[PDB]
Symmetry: D2
Subunit: 483 residues, 4 copies
């Protein structure tokens, strides 16, 4: 099985390839042609040229219709996409069928719709001579959008950037994660089959440093680099595009907290924190790795969660009742297990998990770990401050509202937070004081694609979603007419 | 005369001072205390702490009333502010009385008003359990805003940043240009006398590299760096805040064109290009330095502009019919005369100017140059592509509409453009195809503070003005309530 | 051959029927069942109850999907709808295929899209106790919308009300014009086949006074009456719903002007005024019946228009080069002919037309009149001030700009106006001074569904289109939470 | 004593007929008020039309905003004079006038002047067949002459609530305040004059409704809009009256508002809140609760608690120490309210407290006071539970189920406002969104942000005002489409 680049309307190989490994069993699923500097350039130039082609001449209605045909094209091959995401990542088949693929289809449809309904502004003004003037704004394509995406929700996060870039009439050069290159390749087939003009969408495979990713960010032909990944990678990219003063949008790491107040519906909160800690084996940026529970309910909470966690089925993506699959890679398991050990050395009490499960089959050749819960660590422990990106949470008691607010906020990260309380005043009062981009109250990972989405501090720069995407992926130009 | 820093409600001196020179006659105006890294730290920490004080507890209405009070304080000392801008820069007194100071006052009033009238968004959504969810957004202070500003319109551009920063409830550490520190210092006095709480507004004097400016961009305590200056400086600052992923807003250089079509009102166009090329002695980022005139009117346009340029009075700020003062500094003049030499070397015809005026009085010790017009250079000439920031324009003929649009856009910059035509379709057809942030038709430098403002390519990153400022200087936070 | 009412999911007949006549040849097309008062009540009650059924429980996304299905259902029977519109009205087949039916479909698609993308507002406020309060708004269904539509663009205008009513979650009782009932009836079939729940859409046929129309306006069960028709009918309806304080939205009559300045593209303006005066045989509310032409081009304009009018092909809807069909009915023809005679009695020169064409075939049994052009009437002539709604225009010369603006605005109507000029300043300067809801410059009948649309003075009440429709067809509720 | 004149075309003028202004505290004559006739209303409208073509029409948005801030400044500069005028007319407690009435009226002008400065309009690009495209842009122009007709419950607040956005949008105004409260509007005319507002821009006409200035105004072909606040019946009458001219209309009408106290409410706070919402301005605000529903489990405790607080209410002089309630607006209004007091007894209400008039043994016995009143035991169908009384009264009823009480609140021909008391997050949002009214408060009452849309549903109104909705209503929204 092979995954090729898609450049100027053609699938092409490269002088080098790398292995794509199924993390369920460590088996080789495909070879992936790594694009080189020359190929990246060819992609960017083709995207620049595609801006003056038929793509640039499409009305907003016609463009939106073609974007819906991309969406239709994915729906037509729905189960192939599901198989592709599962293979790369080992995620449960039910998760891919209900979350990953549907949300990616929704990204195209929503931004196609937004593009059709969006408008701009008119400002009337007085002048010295009494005749006045008119200022109006227009949205134009920004140009070539470089897209660099992670492996946690591969197609979803890929299409989260590609859909509005295309909806705004831009062209795209996109580099998916080396760990999850398959669904992105299928998408390039859908684009091609949908008749998306050559050069409008370009897919380059490869790595970051000294590979396609780096090359893309250094290429002077792009107009913007939108990125989702590690905070340190974002800082690196920001330096790379600095001489070109490229527009940037970064969605970076988090060490997200959940907070359970004494008046929470305890069962729902336990359920809630279970989902937020262990979904996708805790490999979601929005996962809660720190949890604060009111002292009066702390023991009862940790008990209930231990039970639920131990009922979780860790196995095959298609196994009956499965809840967790493997981590994305062996290298990633190494770093995660390394934190498991670091936690012990730091004084943690291992409430559950803290190692790898035993299968006595091919899965032992995979990259599984157990859902883990810690207690007993201090606020300054590395395991409570640094992002692990595994199925783990530490639970800590608290006593006062203002105290826990301060403790949640005592982070260099600021992506998201979940609060559990049944009290009206408390919900709104506490929520507004959490220094993050997204707060959920009595739920987790509910996403409305119209809302602004982003993080504060090291967790990012800018907002995307709804009008914020329509703004970022466009040139906003002001035209002033003297009358 | 001495200009002090203003840190945490106190005017403070520093270990070193530097010279503020009057560009009219080369004489010493004042000594300015240069903030060291320790003082910059002190300012940032005070700014952080002020967010937690009385300032942080003001209602939006009370915060707006206080900002209007700052404006009233400037107005109450209007002529002192006029005297200060004039002294630092040599700008004509009438310009300072009609443009610089009144627009600085308007910055505060406009953003105080916007702060009172702004609101956010409500999104309703359905959920699988049929109960639904509410998503609402809020605007919070981003935190401590670092402001670094240029010398071309000192108080105007300085308050362009500080006014929305404060209006959004942020605290500020601001570093004005070393060439123009005086009006900023008066502003600090207005702040103090208006009762702005200690730490909310902090003024640090100094240079950029290895000085106050650099130290500000490096301090981990800021949340954003908003900047107006050279494109190369912007790139440096982008790199400098990259590790901390600070929000950034950049308004950078330009090589702005004016286009004069055959159907222009010729005399209005001549007058318009005269203003756009020579206002503030060509030292405004929005100035035209490239001009394209239709072949049929080229000779007549050049002859007309030569006459008007030679009528310009270059002299004292309060001299009777004065139009132009000097350049900001001897150092800047050295750079400008170097470009004058380069133009001749590149084969230009000097239609007028090209040197320095001889006054035979104290002004000869100052930094004056002549308004200058070139013809005959190619589009590839350095003098036609690089920003000079002096009172100069090159004029070139054109034949065809699409041709001239391409020539305008063939630039690494894209700040502004001015177009002269009496034709309804032409005005709208052409302006939308110019790759810049701002197009004027039949005027120049009309600014409505509600409009988005900024540049493309090397001319900047992001937009400010109106709701764009209200969004940039705020944390936009999303709160999601499961019902 | 028989057109039934559609009430609570069932096609039902009535106690009496009336004749639907083909205006091409006077032949009977169908019998139409006239809804009585009890059936109108039945419709309103069924609509009230459907608010509480499954329709009320759809998410906005599901509701929007269903409205797209309705659009898809029209598209699937495209030619059937074309045949229906043509049969009732005699409009050229090409017009129905290109204007009428596609725009009816677009109505549904556009408001479905707007429903998905619309959101509401969040207001934060301070309170004495320092904890604050949150105000947010929501859009809810207004209730049962009563829709009463005219015969000029039957399906287009019908769906212009029905689409946003359904898009906003309302239920509907709609009464199309007795002159054009066929396409509305076909629409009811499409609703049925698409599975729109019973009672959500209800179609009642009949007349105005003492018939289905009046009864609908008097029913206390509706929440709003949206109407398009003559101004006097609007007044009648305003009184009828007064006791109920029903929400109202009126698009009434006009006497629209076209103005041609000396610098207009003469050929384009002649072509434009030809379309604006004679499209749909002058039976569009937006048609020009008053034309003002600058004196220097008056004779040339009139001579050119006469030539183009006499080239117009008046005939069968499927006659190969047909431009115009008949008027809507013999009764309407008699009214128009009465004005044709009044014009002559008022002193008009008949430049062309002024009577009925002789076909020497079945068309002579239809309701055709000639495209007519008048000159020589004063601004006080009844034929110059009262809406005729036939294929007619008076042409008058003018000399001054403020003069012609005055004569344009000197009217009790204010629907629309078209101005022809190539001058940038004049276009914007004059347009803003015309007291109408809509000005076109160098075109006519360009409609963007996002824009506000309506009249001033006798031409209407309120605005529809874009968010104005989303607001009118919705309850806007404010919810204020003390924290 | 005092005299109140009309203000037409920059001049204070008298009339052929006058009527009396009566202090409701003691029944004493305050002033004579000149009733404008048909001729004078016409003179006002025509002056307002001409004013649109004068210097007023030529001001920039910024200069017009500055002038409106000058009007607010003028009211502030005469603050205590305005307080005295609202109080004299209405008998409202001086503290209410000083903290609610007068400051809000000043805030009305300031808010809409600011909105005027910040507001902008829309740009729509579109594709065309020939591929050159087109641009649609919208502008806001003044609508024209706005007729304003206001009520007596919050005289200057509600008057300026219409007059401020009208002027902010560049309209001219002919305004007719309630015959029951003509004073503060007359003082506003003085402020306008002194502030240099051009003649014809603001015109003040005094009188009644039917066969007087109010009716004449609604009938004049010269106005562009009629904005109105008052009884629902009057709303309908006026809607018929402007129908022939198809005038723009905005109506804020009657209500029979409910308060709901759920079992998880902060009980003491709910008692306090319902006390305020039922008896503030002696129950004479359109936003007052007159129907109350309390969960069965806390019903008795709630009622006994409210009884205690209602009986500690001080009824008396507007400047009396700790006064909570002044008199009703007039003896005529009291007749109406007492009639409902009787009706409640006849329908079988238990009178928990009040139900009569207090005995003062001084001049206040010549005024129009009644007692704060609480009823129980009436059915949802009782007239006193369904008809707007507009006095200091509430009926309290128990309920058991959430959906039940939601249906009971909504079972009304009115739909102005509702207040909900609960400490539950889910409940506040779930229940609020189901209440068929324009405004719901949770755990409070009568908080107003001037930026929010405001209006009623069903008989309680037509349209919305506030923020962008006032900017839209008081403006011509015109679309200009340019083929490129
Ligand atoms: N803020 C969000 O919304 C969000 C969403 C999903 C994931 N994330 C985060 O992403 C991370 C997930 O792991 P990850 O390994 O995919 O992140 P990563 O930074 O290691 O790499 C992500 C992408 O960037 C590329 N890349 C790496 N180095 C590069 C370089 N020097 N130049 C250019 N491109 C380079 C990679 O090839 C990959 O495509 C976590 O930190 C997680 O929190 C954030
Ligand atoms: N402003 C606009 O956008 C617009 C658009 C299209 C047509 N129009 C106008 O419509 C008029 C032509 O159409 P028309 O002849 O069908 O108008 P019309 O007023 O005679 O009738 C229109 C509709 O109203 C119904 N109706 C008539 N009397 C009624 C009553 N007393 N109570 C309730 N309903 C009643 C009719 O049955 C019909 O359905 C022209 O004035 C034209 O300009 C205006
Ligand atoms: O509405 C009256 C005529 C305008 C035609 C349209 O396209 C429309 O109504 O949307
Ligand atoms: O408007 C009705 C009652 C008063 C509420 C307000 O404060 C207002 O209308 O602005
Ligand atoms: Na200097
Ligand atoms: Na017919
Ligand atoms: Na009185």
């Amino acid at each position: 099985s092979q995954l090729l680049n898609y450049i100027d309307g053609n699938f092409v190989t490269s002088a080098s390839s790398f292995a794509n490994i199924n993390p369920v069993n460590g088996k080789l699923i495909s070879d992936v042609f790594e694009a080189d500097a020359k190929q990246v350039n060819e992609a960017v130039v083709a995207a620049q040229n595609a801006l003056k082609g038929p793509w640039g001449k499409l009305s907003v209605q016609d463009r939106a219709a073609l974007i819906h045909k991309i969406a239709d094209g994915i729906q037509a091959r729905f189960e192939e996409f599901v198989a592709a995401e599962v293979a790369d990542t080992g995620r449960p088949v039910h998760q891919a069928r209900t979350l990953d693929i549907p949300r990616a289809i929704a990204n195209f449809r929503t931004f196609a719709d937004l593009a059709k309904t969006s408008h701009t502004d008119l400002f009337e003004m007085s002048t010295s001579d009494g005749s006045g003037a008119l200022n109006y704004t227009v949205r134009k394509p920004l140009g070539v959008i470089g897209v660099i995406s992670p492996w946690d929700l591969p197609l979803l996060l890929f299409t989260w950037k590609v859909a509005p870039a295309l909806a705004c009439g831009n062209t795209v050069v996109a580099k998916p994660s080396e760990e999850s290159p398959s669904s992105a390749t299928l998408l390039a087939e859908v684009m091609h089959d949908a008749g998306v003009p050559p050069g409008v969408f370009n897919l380059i495979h490869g790595f970051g440093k000294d590979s396609a990713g780096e090359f893309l960010t250094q290429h002077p032909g792009i107009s913007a680099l939108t990125f989702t990944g590690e905070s340190k990678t974002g800082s690196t990219i920001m330096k790379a595009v600095a001489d070109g003063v490229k527009e940037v949008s970064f969605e970076l790491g988090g060490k997200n907290a959940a907070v359970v107040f004494a008046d929470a519906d305890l069962d729902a909160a336990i359920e809630g924190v279970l989902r937020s800690s262990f979904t996708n084996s805790g490999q979601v940026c929005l996962c809660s790795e720190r949890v604060y529970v009111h002292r009066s309910i702390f023991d009862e909470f940790v008990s209930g969660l231990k039970v639920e966690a131990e009922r979780l089925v860790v196995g095959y993506p298609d196994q009956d009742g499965v809840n967790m699959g493997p981590l994305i890679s062996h290298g990633h398991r190494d770093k995660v297990l390394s934190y498991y050990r670091l936690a012990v050395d730091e004084g943690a009490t291992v409430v559950t998990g803290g190692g790898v499960p035993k299968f006595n089959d091919e899965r032992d050749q995979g990259a599984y770990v157990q859902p883990t819960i810690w207690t007993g660590l201090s606020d300054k422990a590395r395991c409570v401050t640094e992002e692990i990106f595994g199925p783990v949470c530490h639970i800590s008691p608290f006593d006062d509202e203002d105290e826990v607010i301060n403790r949640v906020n005592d982070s260099n990260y600021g992506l998201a937070c979940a609060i559990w309380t049944t009290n009206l005043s408390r919900a709104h009062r506490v929520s507004r004081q959490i220094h993050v981009g997204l707060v959920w109250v009595n739920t987790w990972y509910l996403r409305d694609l119209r809302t602004p989405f982003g993080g504060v501090k090291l967790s990012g720069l800018g907002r995307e979603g709804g009008r914020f995407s329509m703004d970022f992926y466009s040139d906003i130009a002001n035209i002033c007419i003297k009358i």
